[PDB]
Design a protein around this motif. Structure first.
Motif, PDB file in Angstrom:
ATOM      1  N   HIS A   1       0.879  -1.208   0.000  1.00 32.41           N
ATOM      2  CA  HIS A   1       0.000   0.000   0.000  1.00 32.41           C
ATOM      3  C   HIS A   1       0.881   1.211   0.000  1.00 32.41           C
ATOM      4  O   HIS A   1       0.476   2.333  -0.414  1.00 32.41           O
TER       5      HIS A   1
ATOM      6  N   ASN B   1      -8.920  -4.159   1.400  1.00 31.65           N
ATOM      7  CA  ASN B   1      -8.808  -4.507   2.844  1.00 31.65           C
ATOM      8  C   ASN B   1      -7.416  -4.747   3.316  1.00 31.65           C
ATOM      9  O   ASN B   1      -7.195  -5.158   4.441  1.00 31.65           O
ATOM     10  N   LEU B   2      -6.454  -4.538   2.434  1.00 33.83           N
ATOM     11  CA  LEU B   2      -5.033  -4.732   2.783  1.00 33.83           C
ATOM     12  C   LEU B   2      -4.510  -6.167   2.972  1.00 33.83           C
ATOM     13  O   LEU B   2      -3.399  -6.408   3.386  1.00 33.83           O
TER      14      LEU B   2
ATOM     15  N   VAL C   1       2.374   1.480  16.346  1.00 31.57           N
ATOM     16  CA  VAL C   1       2.841   2.078  15.062  1.00 31.57           C
ATOM     17  C   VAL C   1       1.887   3.185  14.555  1.00 31.57           C
ATOM     18  O   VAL C   1       0.710   3.235  14.897  1.00 31.57           O
ATOM     19  N   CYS C   2       2.389   4.083  13.712  1.00 31.06           N
ATOM     20  CA  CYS C   2       1.529   5.155  13.270  1.00 31.06           C
ATOM     21  C   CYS C   2       2.020   5.584  11.865  1.00 31.06           C
ATOM     22  O   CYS C   2       3.004   5.049  11.339  1.00 31.06           O
ATOM     23  N   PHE C   3       1.325   6.548  11.308  1.00 36.79           N
ATOM     24  CA  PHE C   3       1.707   7.050   9.977  1.00 36.79           C
ATOM     25  C   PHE C   3       3.210   7.183   9.831  1.00 36.79           C
ATOM     26  O   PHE C   3       3.867   7.847  10.589  1.00 36.79           O
ATOM     27  N   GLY C   4       3.767   6.596   8.805  1.00 34.93           N
ATOM     28  CA  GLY C   4       5.179   6.726   8.627  1.00 34.93           C
ATOM     29  C   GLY C   4       5.867   5.395   8.959  1.00 34.93           C
ATOM     30  O   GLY C   4       6.946   5.137   8.512  1.00 34.93           O
ATOM     31  N   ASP C   5       5.195   4.517   9.706  1.00 35.08           N
ATOM     32  CA  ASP C   5       5.818   3.260  10.066  1.00 35.08           C
ATOM     33  C   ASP C   5       5.433   2.176   9.101  1.00 35.08           C
ATOM     34  O   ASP C   5       6.031   1.131   9.124  1.00 35.08           O
ATOM     35  N   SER C   6       4.401   2.415   8.285  1.00 34.75           N
ATOM     36  CA  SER C   6       3.928   1.403   7.386  1.00 34.75           C
ATOM     37  C   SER C   6       5.108   0.942   6.465  1.00 34.75           C
ATOM     38  O   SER C   6       6.037   1.719   6.200  1.00 34.75           O
TER      39      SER C   6
ATOM     40  N   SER D   1       1.445  -2.795   8.521  1.00 35.67           N
ATOM     41  CA  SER D   1       0.401  -2.672   7.481  1.00 35.67           C
ATOM     42  C   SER D   1      -0.704  -1.707   7.793  1.00 35.67           C
ATOM     43  O   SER D   1      -0.904  -0.685   7.058  1.00 35.67           O
ATOM     44  N   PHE D   2      -1.397  -1.965   8.937  1.00 35.03           N
ATOM     45  CA  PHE D   2      -2.524  -1.144   9.303  1.00 35.03           C
ATOM     46  C   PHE D   2      -2.836  -1.152  10.818  1.00 35.03           C
ATOM     47  O   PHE D   2      -2.365  -2.042  11.565  1.00 35.03           O
ATOM     48  N   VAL D   3      -3.602  -0.160  11.207  1.00 38.46           N
ATOM     49  CA  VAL D   3      -4.009   0.103  12.591  1.00 38.46           C
ATOM     50  C   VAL D   3      -5.470   0.293  12.581  1.00 38.46           C
ATOM     51  O   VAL D   3      -6.036   0.505  11.530  1.00 38.46           O
TER      52      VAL D   3
END
Ligand code: 151
Ligand code: 151
Ligand SMILES: *[C@@H]1O[C@H](CO[C@@H]2O[C@@H](C)[C@@H](O)[C@@H](O)[C@@H]2O)[C@@H](O)[C@H](O)[C@H]1NC(C)=O
Ligand SMILES: *[C@@H]1O[C@H](CO[C@@H]2O[C@@H](C)[C@@H](O)[C@@H](O)[C@@H]2O)[C@@H](O)[C@H](O)[C@H]1NC(C)=O
Ligand SMILES: *[C@@H]1O[C@H](CO[C@@H]2O[C@@H](C)[C@@H](O)[C@@H](O)[C@@H]2O)[C@@H](O)[C@H](O)[C@H]1NC(C)=O
Ligand SMILES: *[C@@H]1O[C@H](CO[C@@H]2O[C@@H](C)[C@@H](O)[C@@H](O)[C@@H]2O)[C@@H](O)[C@H](O)[C@H]1NC(C)=O
Lengths: 218, 218
Positions: free
Chosen positions: B41, B84-85, B168-173, B188-190
């Motif tokens: 993604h 859905n990732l 984890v947060c934006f930027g860690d994906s 991947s996602f939160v």
């Protein structure tokens, strides 16, 4: 398609229009009722979730009951190079299965490895740019072309319309090239602009990805 | 990373920053001198020609001579579902080979199908947001986490910090989840927002992809 002719309504029921908002941006090919094939470049920097996969279309300017509209569910790519367009192909699984009828059918593919020789007579098609004097196509167009090797990477199948200025244009990328009944190419790039008369059009070589494609749709 | 700590400099030499004209947007993992893997993604709505794969970095707000910078030469995805990732993984061939040294090393992987059970202890890392106060991390961060199976798909490896709001947060994906020294996960996602304390963080299960990965990296 620059310099081709309108196609007979639903003459190629495997032909697919990829849209974003309410507008066509690339073609594709139905290869299994829940699977299409297109050019990798076509989906690269767009919001794929928004992409509508329209089957059974013929004239994008009109309402068409014959349409079956899907969404993208899975994406597969095998070595696409964004810098030079090597391996310009992507297989898209749909969110559901097409209803195989008069207007919608699965096209057939070439055997792994099958190589094309200078001289063969194929047919290209798309709703791409008519040229630059009037925009996109309303009705699906088709174009007789000839397979060529001159000025072509061994990693592409290329074509050329001998004798005049004609060929694929913006909006035809992802569209199939049909030769003696099988999809031998997906439209990928042009050089010297569209319909230059100098350079052949370049199509991703479907026959080279056959077993890979199969390891996915079968 | 919300509620983690600074990692020791070059503590994790396989740790990669994906950047767009100087701007970090996702992490990745060096899995061969010329291949990284990250989350599909992450490269979905960007011009990949402009993506720089940055190796050997520590502090993003510093000039750093330890760094090696490559571009993407090829792309491989295997059933990535943008809705859905599911299968949120991409392998990226680089335009060259990294020089193996103190600051850059290939990470090790688990064997195909090697699943983890509730309670295993792992370590997540990346350059994402510090929490919602303070922006994106400057120095690489790390965070002790625990594998869990509730509120998790079978097709994901998932973690959760107990007793506090951390994750984890934006930027860690795209960043690696290391467990027992092997890369078992790609961030991947939160859910419920970053570091909700309610929902576990989800990572793509690397182990389910080992055979496909080897076949590309061979
Ligand atoms: C797709 O429609 C192709 C061609 C088949 C028409 C277009 C796509 N670009 S666009 C501006 O998004 O429609 C991809 C490449 N296309 C070109 O028109 C074009 C311009 O230059 C090239 C050739 N390049 C790219 C590969 C190496 C040189 N193709
Ligand atoms: C990556 O940085 C992830 C998380 C690991 C932080 C981000 C990515 N989105 S981005 C960079 O903010 O556009 C991908 C999903 N991420 C989320 O913040 C996020 C927000 O909602 C979700 C839940 N979705 C995805 C699974 C279905 C619902 N993830
Ligand atoms: C498959 O998708 C169809 C298209 O959905 C419509 O277009 C997509 C891209 C989304 O924007 C969606 O929200 C739009 O309504 C559906 O109409 C169709 O029902 C779907 N088929 C299934 C799930 O069986
Ligand atoms: C233009 O081409 C028309 C169809 O070509 C054939 O069918 C397509 C689907 C491909 O399989 C292709 O390999 C075949 O050759 C012909 O009917 C027509 O004769 C052609 N016209 C000229 C002038 O060449
Ligand atoms: C590999 O690419 C390196 C990075 O180049 C920089 O980033 C890419 C995305 C382009 O934007 C490029 O023009 C930028 O300067 C090169 O600096 C490096 O030399 C390359 N090495 C090779 C090709 O072996
Ligand atoms: C925090 O985690 C530290 C490192 O964990 C180990 O190494 C990582 C990379 C993974 O392989 C992980 O599975 C290993 O456990 C521990 O050394 C440290 O003790 C941990 N501390 C606490 C309090 O959990």
């Amino acid at each position: 398609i620059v310099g081709g002719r309108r196609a007979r309504p639903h003459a190629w029921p495997f032909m697919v229009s990829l849209q974003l908002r309410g507008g066509h941006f690339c073609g594709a090919t139905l290869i299994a009722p829940n699977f299409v094939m297109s050019a990798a470049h076509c989906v690269a920097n767009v919001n794929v979730r928004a992409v509508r996969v329209v089957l059974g279309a013929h004239n994008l300017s009109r309402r068409e009951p014959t349409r079956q509209v899907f969404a993208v569910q899975r994406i597969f790519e095998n070595g696409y190079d964004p810098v030079n367009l090597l391996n310009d192909i992507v297989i898209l699984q749909l969110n559901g299965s097409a209803t195989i009828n008069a207007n919608v059918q699965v096209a057939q593919l070439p055997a792994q490895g099958r190589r094309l020789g200078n001289g063969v007579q194929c047919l290209a098609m798309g709703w791409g740019l008519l040229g630059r004097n009037r925009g996109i196509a309303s009705v699906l167009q088709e174009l007789n072309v000839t397979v060529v090797t001159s000025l072509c990477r061994r990693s592409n199948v290329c074509t050329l319309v001998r004798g005049r200025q004609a060929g694929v244009c913006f909006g035809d990328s992802g569209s199939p090239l049909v030769c003696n009944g099988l999809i031998h190419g997906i439209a990928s790039f042009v050089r010297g602009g569209c319909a230059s008369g100098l350079y052949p059009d370049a199509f991703a070589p479907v026959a080279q990805f056959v077993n890979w494609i199969d390891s996915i749709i079968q």
